[PDB]
Symmetry: C5
Subunit: 217 residues, 5 copies
């Protein structure tokens, strides 16, 4: 059903060039105004996240999605023209596209969650060549191992050929330690034998842009 | 016979372009026009911004000699736009006969591009000829469902850090994604060492491209 | 089962501090005092300089929530000292239940007595480690404890960091004699768990110092 | 046998533009040529200067120089960095090798193009039975015989830097270097390789034309 | 018996002044003041040209890590220090060998000057310290035997576990640079080469007095 709708999704991570000015009046309002105008074009900002402290080279993440990649490219450059954007250096910006699963929470469920963890993913070279039953069993068993974490909202979106990775993953939860515990628990899944890359991790706190701007150095 | 070198040059903004960027695109378009008189072809300029944090612009250009493309590259870096950009990745390749090119036979424009380098496993070129022939033929068979994606694979041994540069051009971006996902099922995936960075973006005329960058 | 987030934040000098650095340390100590009043604990500040070309200072701070540590981090970056520094590596973790013991208090909350030196590094196990039969992992973890019994003067901290950053665990070792940390690490190269390691760098090692003497001694 | 007894250190130094050379760059090339002339009088040979621009984003210029001692090449390197051209450049990669038991001593005839890269063999390569190493180095020689127009240099660099060998290929037709390298992918020695990048490929140019053509 | 040793590598931010009078004198006076406090500067080395991202290395050692940290920061306040960017600085100390009873590191026993140096860090394979003791003893004995043809290359092996990213820092001092090259090539035939994970960066250069070193840098 919702697999026939096309939705590109972009996670854009920035770090402070140094700090924001002591007088940062208008910084958040300008960005909120941009986000409001993007919403008129059905470009959705799902959240802005404070990453500072949890990573030395990242401070802010924007999660935005739209029907086309071009809309998100325009949004990205318009953000970089804001006063806040001009105080930031781009760090990591990766797009993904909802594709039908072989055997999406952000489109079905918009209720806010306090924390997020985002990371890219690359499977082993053998993974897509395995017998269909191997991959089906392993993807099924990781679902069963995740059933104890219904409070963690999981997104896994295809990114082949949009960048350096195969999937981008995003986990949303109201309690940060539940993301930690989920990830630790899934280390016991057999699919862990078929992983090549899963960093960088960008983890932080969802905040409204006003509070986000006020809190950054 | 027909020697053609092909170069993909990727740049990122030093910061942003000035608010008043009048003449930035015109100067570059004038340069591309003069290069055309020298049979240096700009196949396209592409907006990479947003899809990568450390890249904003790609130029795909080709010529009969590498020297012509080096000259073109330096002339571009002297333009106002070139002086607002930092070089990120610039890699040349050369059309060579296949063991067992669409960018020269087909010039019709496509909306989107994906460019990435490629390095095979150490033993790939040592496998029995029939093994390579079989896997290369089977990846052709698997790509049959995507005739709307125009593929180029160009040899780059000794021109840089890689063995091949690949470029995929399509009017619908999701078709490039779907092709790449589908070819993950080819046995040739067992003989791969490197395939990044990926540079994917939207083909734009230089005026619109310059206007849209931060 | 009490949640405590712990953060190690590493910085390097942009250049040097000014010849006149009056009030640099005082401003930071005042911030640390205000944070302590809000139950944000600065366990230590450490001089890393010289032992690493790209690091000079580390702060170990911990609190009930990640958010409190994010606020502390940004407030530190606003100090004069903070504005003279470039962030290098900042990684958070928290104690979670061990697989094979019933301890629920991490060592750093149980023992806060001061130690002269520290070594901090992240850790990532082999892909197969958590897939091994339980008894194998139990045995190898038991053996690394047994091999560490000759080093009771090295205080060890093991805290989970899955999904908070690029790693699985953050480890910290606190000792009054720096060579005892070296000798411990060398000795544990004989543990079979070494066959199940993927990543364990960067190492940030240095001398615990009061912020006044730390600021005075930096270039 | 006057070949593998004469001592010769060889250095490949790669630079990139900090940004761009000035529009008025008169005297830049002449100052460098004057230095090269003074170095030749001290038996420091500049085998070539090469335009790498465009073929790599982080490289514009390479100098290949060689001398009887490493110290002479260190002096040459620093003197170049004091020229106006040198002060407009940032060092990128500079690696020395030492001729141990090469055509850069037997053949001075210019060639239009160069490809330079470092090399590290598998950990067990030097532990293989001598027959295996003899066979593979011999077969790889056989595979290169169709490319006599490509001049090959392989120079030991153990302990001078991060590598085991530095390789340099010189040819008048750039496509012949490409074709040689592709052909040698069929050599058994390819099973015993750990590292072979960065590649620095470019066009040999006199310093005047090189300086005029850089951004 | 405890002696920490530190190798600190720097690169020029750009160049030194054309008139750099006083640069070397200030550093030499710092070295003299440090020697009065039993902080030894074993050598300063010109790395330039042999590496694009390094120009100067200092080998210094002292009874405590803290003394070397102070020395490092004091050097960074000199005019020369302020013209340099730190690149790589790694500390180590001699610890008892597994299979010999020597307790004095070579660098404390022999300080006669040598023209050239090669310094690099080292990390063994994950299984190396898990091998049967006899296998490790045999391979270490064989690498000593293969080095017997190079008595003119002075070797130091110091432990660096937990002080940085490595297990050992190695230093080789010789009057003829080609002898270091030849030693390393020869030891590629040792069985211990099957048990290596990391051995770069290599910092190789010429020992110089600080005056001539400063004079020769760009």
């Amino acid at each position: 059903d919702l697999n026939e709708v096309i939705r590109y999704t972009l996670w854009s991570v920035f770090k402070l060039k140094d700090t924001l000015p002591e007088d940062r009046a208008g910084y958040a309002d300008e960005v909120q105004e941009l986000f409001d105008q993007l919403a008129a074009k059905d470009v959705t900002i799902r959240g802005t996240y404070d990453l500072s402290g949890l990573r030395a080279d990242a401070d802010l993440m924007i999660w935005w999605h739209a029907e086309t990649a071009d809309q998100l490219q325009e949004a990205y450059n318009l953000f970089r023209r804001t006063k806040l954007g001009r105080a930031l250096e781009p760090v990591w910006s990766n797009m993904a596209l909802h594709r039908p699963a072989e055997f999406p929470a952000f489109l079905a469920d918009e209720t806010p969650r306090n924390y997020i963890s985002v990371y890219p993913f690359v499977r082993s070279y053998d993974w897509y060549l395995l017998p269909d039953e191997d991959r089906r069993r392993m993807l099924a068993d990781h679902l069963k191992m995740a059933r104890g974490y219904p409070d963690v909202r999981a997104n896994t979106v295809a990114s082949f050929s949009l960048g350096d990775y195969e999937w981008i993953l995003a986990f949303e939860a109201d309690e940060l330690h539940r993301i930690v515990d989920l990830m630790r628990h899934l280390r016991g899944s057999e699919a862990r034998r078929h992983v090549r890359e899963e960093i960088p991790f960008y983890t932080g706190r969802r905040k409204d842009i006003g509070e986000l701007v006020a809190g950054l150095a």
